[PDB]
Design a protein around this ligand. Sequence first.
Ligand SMILES: [Mg+2]
Ligand SMILES: [Mg+2]
Ligand SMILES: [Mg+2]
Ligand SMILES: [Mg+2]
Ligand SMILES: [Mg+2]
Ligand SMILES: [Mg+2]
Ligand SMILES: [Mg+2]
Ligand SMILES: [Mg+2]
Ligand SMILES: [Mg+2]
Ligand SMILES: [Mg+2]
Ligand SMILES: [Mg+2]
Ligand SMILES: [Mg+2]
Ligand SMILES: [Mg+2]
Ligand SMILES: [Mg+2]
Ligand SMILES: [Mg+2]
Ligand SMILES: [Mg+2]
Ligand SMILES: [Mg+2]
Ligand SMILES: [Mg+2]
Ligand SMILES: [Mg+2]
Ligand SMILES: [Mg+2]
Ligand SMILES: [Mg+2]
Ligand SMILES: [Mg+2]
Ligand SMILES: [Mg+2]
Ligand SMILES: [Mg+2]
Ligand SMILES: [Mg+2]
Ligand SMILES: [Zn+2]
Lengths: 61, 213, 135, 101
Amino acid sequence: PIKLARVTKVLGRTGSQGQCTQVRVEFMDDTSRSIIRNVKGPVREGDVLTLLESEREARRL
Amino acid sequence: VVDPFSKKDWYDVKAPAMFNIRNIGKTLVTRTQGTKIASDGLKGRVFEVSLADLQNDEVAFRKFKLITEDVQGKNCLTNFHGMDLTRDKMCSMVKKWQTMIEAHVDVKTTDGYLLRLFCVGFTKKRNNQIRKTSYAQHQQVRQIRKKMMEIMTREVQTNDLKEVVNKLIPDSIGKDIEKACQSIYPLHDVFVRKVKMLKKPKFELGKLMELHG
Amino acid sequence: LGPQVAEGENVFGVCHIFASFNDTFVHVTDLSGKETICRVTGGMKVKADRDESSPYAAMLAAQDVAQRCKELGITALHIKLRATGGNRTKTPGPGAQSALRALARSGMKIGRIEDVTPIPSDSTRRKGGRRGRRL
Amino acid sequence: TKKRRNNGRAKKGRGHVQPIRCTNCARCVPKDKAIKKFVIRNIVEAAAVRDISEASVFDAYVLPKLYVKLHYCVSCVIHSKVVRNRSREARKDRTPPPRFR
RNA sequence: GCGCAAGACGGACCAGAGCGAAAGCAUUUGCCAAGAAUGUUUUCAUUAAUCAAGAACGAAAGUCGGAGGUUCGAAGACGAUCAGAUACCGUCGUAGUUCCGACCAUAAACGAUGCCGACCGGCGAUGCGGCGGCGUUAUUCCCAUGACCCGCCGGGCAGCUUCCGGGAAACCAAAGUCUUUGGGUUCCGGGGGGAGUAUGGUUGCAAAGCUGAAACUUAAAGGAAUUGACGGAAGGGCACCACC
RNA sequence: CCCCAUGAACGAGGAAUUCCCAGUAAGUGCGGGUCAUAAGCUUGCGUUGAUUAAGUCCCUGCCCUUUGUACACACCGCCCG
RNA sequence: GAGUAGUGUUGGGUCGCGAAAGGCCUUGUGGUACUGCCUGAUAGGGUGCUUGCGAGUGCCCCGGGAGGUCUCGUAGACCACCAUG
Ligand SMILES: [Mg+2]
Ligand SMILES: [Mg+2]
Ligand SMILES: [Mg+2]
Ligand SMILES: [Mg+2]
Ligand SMILES: [Mg+2]
Ligand SMILES: [Mg+2]
Ligand SMILES: [Mg+2]
Ligand SMILES: [Mg+2]
Ligand SMILES: [Mg+2]
Ligand SMILES: [Mg+2]
Ligand SMILES: [Mg+2]
Ligand SMILES: [Mg+2]
Ligand SMILES: [Mg+2]
Ligand SMILES: [Mg+2]
Ligand SMILES: [Mg+2]
Ligand SMILES: [Mg+2]
Ligand SMILES: [Mg+2]
Ligand SMILES: [Mg+2]
Ligand SMILES: [Mg+2]
Ligand SMILES: [Mg+2]
Ligand SMILES: [Mg+2]
Ligand SMILES: [Mg+2]
Ligand SMILES: [Mg+2]
Ligand SMILES: [Mg+2]
Ligand SMILES: [Mg+2]
Ligand SMILES: [Zn+2]
């Protein structure tokens, strides 16, 4: 299933070369579920991310 | 070349009448070529089964070894063999500031099965306890050991396998030790951690038939 | 091509996953364990000695045995995980973890998970020598 | 010059201690000096958690955990960075590091 | 997977915990003798402290015999790595590792700190015995008794702390009570090498152990701490002449 | 320098690597230097004018801090048979 | 009636838990909290769910009533080259 996500906070930048941003995800379905997630490119708080695999969790690079 | 797997045949392992759920599962045996009796090749097997699967209400970590003896034509007849704790739980209990206590007995049941029963316990931290450590002194320990020993001996020695297994399912015996020892020291987790088998009596169809139904 | 059972009920095999640091086995048997259904090993799927252990091997091996058992009517697998045990390592090798995750994906059912590494009460002397294995 | 007052090993008021073989090396070290570390984790790790959780035939089956006590001979630790060297004064503090937030 | 067999080893619990003169000493259970501490309005009445000579026990390896040989494993053999490796790494493997019976007497046998004794700050802990004290628990009331709890006493194993005082300093509540120098006592050191060698004596089955010089040679050798420099040691830190 | 002819390699460049964050990279001409005659070089000058990042120590490079040292002519050190 | 009957146990005790039949002799308390499950009391001992975690909040039984993606925060990040000067 395809899902949507909301940015609650920006925590740090994960990467070897300092590539990924490690961001915190609310679900736009009004659910309270909170998952950390890796995102590439620029991110500011409040943005919406589209997840193709929505059950996956964030690991440290 | 030739597929070994088409000469296979599926059989049904059904547990005895002690527990709730009957069919533990399926077992796979190569058909009789007449040089080798398949009923015999199948005759000697153990099964490692979680109690959770035999009877619906219970704890995951008690395992039963079950032996097939007779085959009923795609029914296998299973008698109790052994019992043990899942390694996970056994490790979960053991911790660093408490004394551990272990004992074991060899007992013949009334019908003649010979069992080895193992006994595990721990010193439990009292609820307001300020001191870091619950240790028990040597003589206290030995007291406990002796009582563990005494209890389960009398529990088995009086009863036949049927009632023994029946006591082992909920673990009556553990709770028994625990209550009985509160005077000497506050025992904590107390189990029969293992059950072994030493001698089965000469095999008898009738006895087993009664055990199944 | 196997057991005759309704669509609800799942046939259980017992899968032994052995991960040393050398290589993995994904080994699937009956309940008794006295009959093996299927056995695939790490060094089998991949050719190089280095790669013998590595998670990738686990992947392949697992996908394959799981397939082959999906053939024979075994849907659900009890899992007994194993580390090399005895005097040597009690950690399971890296392979096992991957392997496990893998034969989930193939659509297998997972029964109880249990950990059996042979663990000594007290062993024979370990294979290095007093001052250790230095490198 | 005496470096530690306790000489690195915890042995006090007894003469000799039963030696144990290292996890990593196999090098022999007395049980007192050995840098000990206890490990409780889950058999399956982070991601495969969520994965396997779906493939169960059981509802609310909680993953078993793996329990292992490690010993590390003084050398092997410092290589594995289980233990790192610290300053003359800050040496003296035997309070275990704050893994508790 | 199921059984069988053999010899080893007693995991986790196990700790700056115990016990032993030190070496050393962890499965259960019974038998055999010891032992500290505690308790005491018991008994003896100076019987004690330390000790040349002389003794008892003394890790590991080693040595004789016997038994036994799972694992590990000097020696050795290969396989690698390397310029070379008779070394680290790997596959093997003899003696040995194990038990019984005799020898051997040495270890960084270390607290690198003789033993008995007196006095000199605190502070919490811990082990053993004792003594007192609300209150919990072993179900509901009485006494025992055990478990926790709050103290006190005597021995212990230690710890933290401190302008007690020492100390060349590191550090030490002893390494304190030392030029304000004396409680008793035993071993023992006198620049570095030569050398724990030569010789004699003596012990052993031998490997060796104890005892132990000299010629010569040499301005330092050494101990703590301090700035440096360096590290194939650990952490941070920056820079589009580093990357993303 | 100029007119005619001659009209060849070259099909977006392997392992590696260089310079760069906003009137900036880059394209494009122009001035000054050298100069009797000369800019495929340099030094300046405008013009057209972006993609991407506002982060990280992975690599490379040096800095501190802790730490060990038998080095101090300071590791190209010292030193053993 | 009677803390008797019955029932219950580590050492004992002057015991712990605790009925009913049936009558007699005339009312035969109020106020005020809570309450997941297990064991053995609303005590004691284990053990939980609500959102990954930490807070809150709720979780004995019945009837009826409506109101619903409970609220607030939130790192929860873990998968051997190389002599000499
Ligand atoms: Mg040093
Ligand atoms: Mg010693
Ligand atoms: Mg002592
Ligand atoms: Mg043990
Ligand atoms: Mg003498
Ligand atoms: Mg010896
Ligand atoms: Mg020997
Ligand atoms: Mg011999
Ligand atoms: Mg060679
Ligand atoms: Mg070798
Ligand atoms: Mg070998
Ligand atoms: Mg002697
Ligand atoms: Mg000596
Ligand atoms: Mg000495
Ligand atoms: Mg003396
Ligand atoms: Mg006491
Ligand atoms: Mg008292
Ligand atoms: Mg004391
Ligand atoms: Mg003097
Ligand atoms: Mg001299
Ligand atoms: Mg001498
Ligand atoms: Mg001589
Ligand atoms: Mg020095
Ligand atoms: Mg770097
Ligand atoms: Mg110098
Ligand atoms: Zn090591």
